[PDB]
Amino acid sequence: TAIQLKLNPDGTMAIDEETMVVDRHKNASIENEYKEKVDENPFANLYNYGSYGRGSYTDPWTVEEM
C-alpha cells in the first residue's frame, strides 16, 4: 500500500492524488464479506451465573498420564 504514480503524455512523472490517501476500510470489508452469516434467535443468548468468568473444563486424566 505504498504511493503510486503514472506517466502521462501531458504531464509526465505525475503522482496520483487518490493514492496519496488511504481508505482504511476496503481492506477490512473484504474479510467481513467473507464471514459466515447467521440469524440471531433471542433465545440463544441466554446467560447465567456461569458467564464471563475465567475457568474452563479440565480434560480428565488418564492412566497413561499417571
Binding site: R24, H25, A28, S29, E31, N32
Partner: protein, 50 residues
C-alpha cells in the same frame, strides 16, 4: 365526497403517509455509522417499522 374522504383529511392522510413510506426513506439516508478506531465495525439499518 365526504363519506370516503372525511373532515380531517389533511391531518390524518399526512401522518398515514409518514408511518408507512416516509420512514424507510430516512434510514436509507443515515445508514452505516462507522468508527475510525477498529475499522471493521459497522452498524447498518435494514428497515424500520412502527
Amino acid at each position: 365526497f365526504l363519506k370516503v374522504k372525511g373532515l380531517v383529511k389533511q391531518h390524518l392522510d399526512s401522518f398515514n403517509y409518514f408511518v408507512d413510506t416516509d420512514l424507510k426513506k430516512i434510514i436509507k439516508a443515515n445508514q452505516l455509522i462507522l468508527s475510525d478506531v477498529d475499522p471493521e465495525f459497522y452498524l447498518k439499518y435494514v428497515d424500520i417499522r412502527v
